[PDB]
């Protein structure tokens, strides 16, 4: 199964290629705030699973599908993301929901 990102701000969906994808400041996600690194985190799609690893001093945030608050992620650790979960590159901004393919 594959994966795509759904911006919570109503931006168009972003498909994720198999393997690793660097996310952060850049055209892929349309992020311009300079508090987000151009190499802010890694997303890996492999064997039907998505995991995220924050790789910058400025953190990533995590919110599981059945929870209601963006929690800061442990730096440089992998976290598996299920369909319905969300992650973000700022605590209140640049939030993305995980969708599976097929859905």
């Amino acid at each position: 199964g594959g994966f795509e990102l759904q911006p919570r701000d109503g931006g168009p969906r972003v498909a994720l290629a198999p393997g690793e994808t660097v996310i952060g400041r850049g055209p892929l996600l349309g992020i311009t705030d300079k508090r987000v690194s151009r190499r802010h985190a890694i997303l890996e799609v492999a064997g039907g699973q998505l995991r995220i690893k924050p790789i910058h001093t400025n953190p990533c945030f995590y919110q599981s599908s059945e929870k209601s608050q963006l929690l800061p992620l442990k730096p440089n650790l992998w976290c598996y993301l299920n369909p319905g979960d969300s992650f973000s590159l700022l605590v209140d901004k640049y939030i993305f929901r995980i969708l599976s393919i097929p859905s």
Binding site: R25, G26, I31, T32, K34, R35, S37, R38, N58
Partner: peptide, 8 residues
């Protein structure tokens, strides 16, 4: 719009 060093 996407270039420039990151801020901490």
């Amino acid at each position: 719009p996407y270039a420039g060093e990151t801020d901490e």
